[PDB]
């Protein structure tokens, strides 16, 4: 059904643009994280 | 307790200062650290707890760090444990199944 | 269909490519970070 494709294609976009974000997110806390100890 | 957590975590700094009663101890499901390491694929805290003299032992379900490696899929860590002891490569579990098993099972 | 269900697949795959990387990022950050007032 065309129809639930094309709402799962939207859906799995929506997905993609959240996940992106949150490793954009992910790499700033690396970025800015205190290593002390296990440095 | 700290050294199970670092283990599990592959913090090695913290595995480092805390080393043998405490290396081959496991807990309520009979993992020792080097079970922990191998189960989350920290193959330099598995090579640092093999160095200093831990040894291959089972689990409660008699799954060997080899056993936690392969169904992980951490060729790295398995590399670790296979060029240290060349021995617990077709050590079985409580159901039959060998490293090899895991691996085939897992994809 | 089949044209959209294979375009679903590349976008999955990629998704499951960008979470892997998610996935060892974080568990990088628990590696490195301080546990001093939650030890």
Chains 1, 3 share one sequence.
Not at chain 2, 38 to 49: E, I, M, R, S, T
Request: hydrophobic share 40%; proline share 1%.
């Amino acid at each position: 059904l065309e129809m639930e494709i094309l709402k799962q294609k939207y859906r799995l976009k929506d997905l993609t643009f959240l996940l992106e974000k949150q490793h954009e997110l992910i790499k700033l806390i690396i970025q800015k994280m205190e290593i002390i100890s296990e440095t | 307790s700290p050294l199970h957590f670092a283990a599990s975590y592959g913090r090695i700094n913290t595995c480092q200062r805390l080393l043998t009663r405490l290396l081959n101890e496991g807990d309520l499901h009979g993992m020792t650290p080097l079970h922990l390491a191998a189960k989350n694929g920290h193959d330099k805290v598995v090579q640092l707890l093999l160095k200093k003299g831990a040894l291959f032992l089972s689990d409660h379900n008699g799954w060997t760090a080899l056993h936690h490696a392969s169904m992980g899929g951490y060729t790295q860590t398995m590399k670790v444990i296979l060029d240290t002891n060349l021995k617990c490569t077709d050590r079985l579990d409580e159901d039959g199944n060998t490293a090899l098993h895991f691996a085939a099972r897992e994809g």
